[PDB]
Amino acid sequence: SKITKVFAREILDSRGNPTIQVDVYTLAGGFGSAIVPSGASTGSREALELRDTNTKYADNWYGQKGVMTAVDNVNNIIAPEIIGLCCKNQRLIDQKIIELDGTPNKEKLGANAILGVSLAVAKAAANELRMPLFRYLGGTNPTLMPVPMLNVINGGEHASNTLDFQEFMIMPLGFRTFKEALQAANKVFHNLAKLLKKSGFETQVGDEGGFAPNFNSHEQALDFLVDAIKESGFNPGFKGENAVAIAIDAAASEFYNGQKYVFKKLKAASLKFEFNSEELLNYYGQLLAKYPIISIEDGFAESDWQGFIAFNQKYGNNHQIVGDDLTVTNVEILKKAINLKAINSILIKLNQIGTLSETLDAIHLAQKSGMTAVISHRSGESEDTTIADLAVAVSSGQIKTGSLSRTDRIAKYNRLLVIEEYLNSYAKADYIGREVFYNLKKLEHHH
Amino acid sequence: SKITKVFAREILDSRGNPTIQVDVYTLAGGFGSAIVPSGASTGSREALELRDTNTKYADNWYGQKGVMTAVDNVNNIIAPEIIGLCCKNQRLIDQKIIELDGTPNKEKLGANAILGVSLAVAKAAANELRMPLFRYLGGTNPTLMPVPMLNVINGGEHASNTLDFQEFMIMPLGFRTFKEALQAANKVFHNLAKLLKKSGFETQVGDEGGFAPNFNSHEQALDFLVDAIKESGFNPGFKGENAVAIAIDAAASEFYNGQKYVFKKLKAASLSKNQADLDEKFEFNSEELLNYYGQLLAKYPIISIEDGFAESDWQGFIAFNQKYGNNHQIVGDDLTVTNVEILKKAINLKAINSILIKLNQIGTLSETLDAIHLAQKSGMTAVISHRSGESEDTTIADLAVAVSSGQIKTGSLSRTDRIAKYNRLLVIEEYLNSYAKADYIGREVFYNLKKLEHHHHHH
Amino acid sequence: SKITKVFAREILDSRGNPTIQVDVYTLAGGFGSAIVPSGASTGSREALELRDTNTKYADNWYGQKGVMTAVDNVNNIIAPEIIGLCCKNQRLIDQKIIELDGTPNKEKLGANAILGVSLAVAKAAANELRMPLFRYLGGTNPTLMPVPMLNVINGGEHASNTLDFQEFMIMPLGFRTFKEALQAANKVFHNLAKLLKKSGFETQVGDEGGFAPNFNSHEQALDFLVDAIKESGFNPGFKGENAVAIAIDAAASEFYNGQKYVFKKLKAASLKFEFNSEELLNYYGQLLAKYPIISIEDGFAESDWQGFIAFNQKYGNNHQIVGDDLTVTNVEILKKAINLKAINSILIKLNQIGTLSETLDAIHLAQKSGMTAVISHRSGESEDTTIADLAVAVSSGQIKTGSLSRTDRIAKYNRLLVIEEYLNSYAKADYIGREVFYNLKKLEHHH
Amino acid sequence: SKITKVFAREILDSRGNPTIQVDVYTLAGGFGSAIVPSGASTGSREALELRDTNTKYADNWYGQKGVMTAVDNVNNIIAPEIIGLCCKNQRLIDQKIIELDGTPNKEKLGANAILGVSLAVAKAAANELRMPLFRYLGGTNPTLMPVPMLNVINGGEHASNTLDFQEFMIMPLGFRTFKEALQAANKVFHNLAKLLKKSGFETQVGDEGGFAPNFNSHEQALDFLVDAIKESGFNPGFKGENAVAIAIDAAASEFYNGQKYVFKKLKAASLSKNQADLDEKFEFNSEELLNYYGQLLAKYPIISIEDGFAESDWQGFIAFNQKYGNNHQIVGDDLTVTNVEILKKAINLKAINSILIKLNQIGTLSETLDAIHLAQKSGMTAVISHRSGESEDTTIADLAVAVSSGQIKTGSLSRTDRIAKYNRLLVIEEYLNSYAKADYIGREVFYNLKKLEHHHHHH
């Protein structure tokens, strides 16, 4: 049915910074509403969100982070182009809006203005057809509940501990249903908190609702994590029942100087810290041998493609190698990562590319080529749960959407529970654990 | 129109523990859906949520915290009783479900099963009437956007720091609109986070999205707060433009031992383990604690103090309200637990001039509205409050506007479990701006204060 | 839904004088109709109704009391401003209409033109939503049936008896339901009439359907009233079951010469009559000691604020002190009465302020400050029963709407019976008698 | 469309006594609601309302006047019989309810229960057809706005004055429109009230909103009336512009003793208690009373006299109609009590040329329409009448227009129980002005008068 009304407003995201919400109405009574997550404002590689810097709105909010200009672009520019088009024509609307902005990185109107409309339009159509969004996006056959990557331990520049790696995650593999996998994650998370309190660590949380306790090294954190998995009644590893694996996001661009990798906080604490690409690759195989790490993200720097290609060739048959800063959901960079065998997996961030149709094009390219497409959250989030319906719609098999606290993450797990409930009555719900890694030629026993 | 379907499910709250969501459908096409916040499981005074302890469900989630029994109670017991009733009859529905449970503290079916149905019914009726929830709850005339009590600094039992008081809050008073007041709180919050980092304090957050840095005393925390307000461009105080006040939740039941109040984290930091407090430096009887509050009130722009004395120390409250109740808000939380009979006692004894309102502590929407109305009729403010375990549900935003509470307490400025409520207030403000008027009146919401003074004035 | 039609006509009120009726229709089929009661045509303090004086309509009706000009203002000026607005936006419509008139006392278009539209709009919205008006006005929670103040005995300038006080009322307190309270009032009223006939007094009625028999003094009237309450089977007093209290409207502005109060008819009959403020205050305490008078209205003159303040301070803890001529439902005067502790209660007359939203603002201000808001009728009335729904919507706890004869009063009691019936099935109906006086610090036993 | 719900309740009438209101709903969304006026409880001739005497309800209201039994009879007996019938079948419904009661005077269920349903059914059918009630009752052609008989001066049993006749009325004849005639009555009424005050008379009102001042005789009252008409700017008379006539309800059954008519209030004012009326100064046989009427008719512009003779004095009526029936209206009220069989007798004996019509004296709408039609076919006028106990119900306004009665009797110009009917006539006049034509024909409504004369003419 025809779109009758498009309206945007400025609200706050989960970090206390402005973001944009878009409502869409249709003649037949459909209503769709979406909230854009936080993204990049500068960069030459990703779609660019538009903030209120150097406008009459700049002083509204701290750091000039308002998005009223994007709101004005939706309400004044995008809306009259879109009103009167059939809402079920997602690809036409997305293409309409891309051309209206006319720049490749969506810098003129704002990636946040464009994505907000793109997603609200799709939700309005799904609402009108009285279909869950994952059915509208995916057709009749989606059944695959994704394995979650749950943040638990955090490092990097902004964390006061001595972990130079960015984040550590658990992945609940050996379970028959999504509900049981989430229950296991709930047990590991709360037992993890209990152990951290028992050893005198802090249990406050960061932007993803995980912990950043004062660990002295990667090895200590990995040791602590293995123990918490065992305390909860599960088995650290890949195969078998109750298996729970670990995944790491190294964010290696952050500790690369163009020639060497430096564990800067570890080095400062001691007052091996330096690695060339081959030595860093060696450290990983040490960790991969000792601990049950199924997946490493941004193991090397965005400018160290040779490190990536050698990483993928040495461990990519048996471990997931994820690009994030390497690829920024850029289809052209993805084609090069495919052609050069640099990774076997990619993070998908809707607001890094700017529309739903482009995101689906990028997901399909990654999967056609034998990689997994891990649907990812952002730092600044909301109760919008699009990415839960997206992960089921495209059979991603994997989602990355935070630890087990804060509604900005929890809502996505709740949405997966509601989707699982819907598939249990009116279809079939599938949770296949370790089998989601179709990109790994062989998956071996960790022991 | 008639209720056709009531369905409940188990989901997770913002602390990662199970809670309950209820959906209600009406024959006219209305849909309403509510998520119950975390509450008390034991206690002799408030409505009791039901967890899965000693059931076939106990092993589902950590700590035996599932709520499948309450889900079954909605789906198997409450729903057949409620289907077929007109959804607009809120008081009838709530009365029927209260009688169906039959216990005064809602223990049999669970206060969480009962509140979930109570709220989803109301939202479905509003949805079918194409009215915002606050217009359904409140009639034609509500226009009052509430002043937020924004958590920023946390202390008390579980914080590693040396603050014995449980939380410190800012209240943006001297602003023309709710949007501008929220912009001011945004500026104080991020400037506070920058100042904290600048001094080497931690900037992770707790349950309500505020900070628990390693402060050494109440005074150190309060000094830091005052400077953050100034650094943001505002004036710490009560009256005038750009005024930003402070509120405190002492939660004094937690450091009362039966006879004296003991600043036990502060004392464990000075005294070694073999030492007694021979000088009574960290101990206070009621009057001595009242003297300490008076000192803080004179030096710092503290407009409101919650649970200044213990739940069993009614005398301490009565003396507190006697000495500073004309010029300062005195809130009962643990003292009153949203209990109508205890509020009548507090009104009769003149113990407080304000009360926190927690939907799930009383257990239905109609009883909550009875309790709010009794508080306001008696000249008290009713502060609509969040819980520690929360969701994207924003009922309390609409409730605060519907009853013209004038004040809401729903957390710091991070985490969607708090942010969604401020966002709902922004949407309500936008609705009132085009179809009515939105009023933000700042310090004028303290109608319970006989004489609000200038803070900078020498008292 | 959108207002499609607004139409006004001139009809007659209950005194045989013109008044205005307004109909409102909406696109969805809602219909609302309201009749304005009679109000002031001159005065510098209240909203001013517009009569046909010095127009081509002046000779239509006796005393030039037509309201065709107001009817023309609704049909020609107000209606085209309002048509096409959503009827559920009461505050917007009221604010629209205030600005359209543009004068503070609504003198240009007429308070009667403005109130007629304001009320008909609200009834149309309530009708459209298939909600009783008190639910539309008040939300989900209203349950409080008000205690009625029933006129029974009348004095003042226009009454040929020797009562200088304006009116005497009964208030049925000690009863469990509104129905029973009204039944008690019906018994006192008819027994009162029987006793008056037995003693040779006249039983014809005035504008409020009460009596004005040839009593010689206030004391004789109060004696007669106490006896009738006893004859009917009830107890004169405040507390206990079957308690029925008395309330007085002195209308003291009428017998004040700027320096003294003169009981003029009592003085003329004798051919104590003169009182300064302190002596008048003394007379009241005499009556308050002898008879069960719970409430005195306009005990002192509108220009004698010092008399009011001393009245409230000497008996206001235990008796209701009502302003009427003192405050004329004027929010700014009300603020001064609150600030100066002159009264603990105020009459609310919708057509003295001019719109429903302003009336609700005034009610809310009075209640927030610890006063009771007594919803009042006017002398010239109709079968419109708005004030019954208003008293329940705002939990006034008290209504003042006439004696127990004439449909211009009876309709309001019937509407309370229909509201009580609605609350009995679909909610709860509450009648709390003596507890409505939350403004009285202590309520003592009259004996 | 089909009736889906019939519900009755007890409310109060304009004298503060219980009466009954009935609501009727139809499947198509029609709603109709009627309020029954006060009637007779005992009597051998008219339909009988049922009060709560000797029931569990007797103590509810003063005088045992409740009507809950009739309410129960609607809700428990009549409603199940009527639900499912098409609402447009007025005659069917009325026939079914008459048979359901089974007694000729409607004593078993109550004439008030029966009439309430009868009228609410008709109003619901009109409401569902989006027709004003008078178009539903009357067809396409009604246009005749009735001349009002406006009570102004009251006497008889309960008035303290010395008038033995029960009421005096004005009728505004010489005017072009109903609005103008009502404006004239408004002017006479308020000028009459001013003149009364000017002479020290009382100005409170009785049941019908007219005056009962302390007049000494019929002549004094009639003189006052004539001067008020002149003071208002009109001409007391029958013909020509601005004519205002007078009508009288003698209610002569009240001062007939069986043999003679006795002006008993007039006599109690002249004669002391020990005195007989040796001269027969205040007594009248039939012929002597007819001579007295003739005297008043010659001096005063009296166009109509109601109940000039007693209910049992059929001969007095027959002689009255013989002597002055060509030139004056002769109304039966107590004589006929809206009884079809008694009207046939009055027609056959030529006792009257006009009859009052009281819905609740016969008990259904179809029987009322039968009675009106029989009266008009026989050359009589049918004057649609109010009762002493009334409400804002305005059925009789629509009824008077629907049947082209030409005359209505519904009280003075104060009290909503009377004013609402004039207001309904103003709304009907407005409807006819835009969608048809409104006719006010003044003196021409007396089609029952063989020769209406000029009053000022010497007869």
Numbering used by the authors:
A (entry chain B), C (entry chain B): 2 to 272, 282 to 457
B (entry chain A), D (entry chain A): 2 to 460
Question: What do the study's own words say?
Answer:
Enolase (EC 4.2.1.11) is a conserved metalloenzyme present in almost all organisms of the phylogenetic tree that plays a role as a phosphopyruvate hydratase in the reversible chemical reaction of 2-phosphoglycerate (2-PG) to phosphoenolpyruvate (PEP) in the glycolysis pathway. Surface enolase is recognized as a plasminogen receptor in several pathogens and is thought to be involved in extracellular matrix degradation and host cell invasion. The assembly of monomer enolase varies among species and is present either as a dimer or octamer but seldom both. Among them, Mycoplasma hyopneumoniae (M. hyopneumoniae, Mhp) is the causative agent of enzootic pneumonia (EP), which is a chronic respiratory disease in pigs and causes significant economic loss in pig production globally.
However, the structure of the enolase of Mycoplasma, which is found in an independent evolutionary branch of bacteria, remains unknown. The structure showed a unique Mycoplasma enolase with characteristic long loops in the S3/H1, H6/S6, H7/H8, and H13 regions. As a virulence factor candidate found in our previous studies, Mhp Eno showed a surface localization on M. hyopneumoniae cells as determined by flow cytometry and electron microscopy. Mhp Eno specifically adhered to STECs and recognized the host plasminogen. All of these results show the unique features of Mhp Eno.
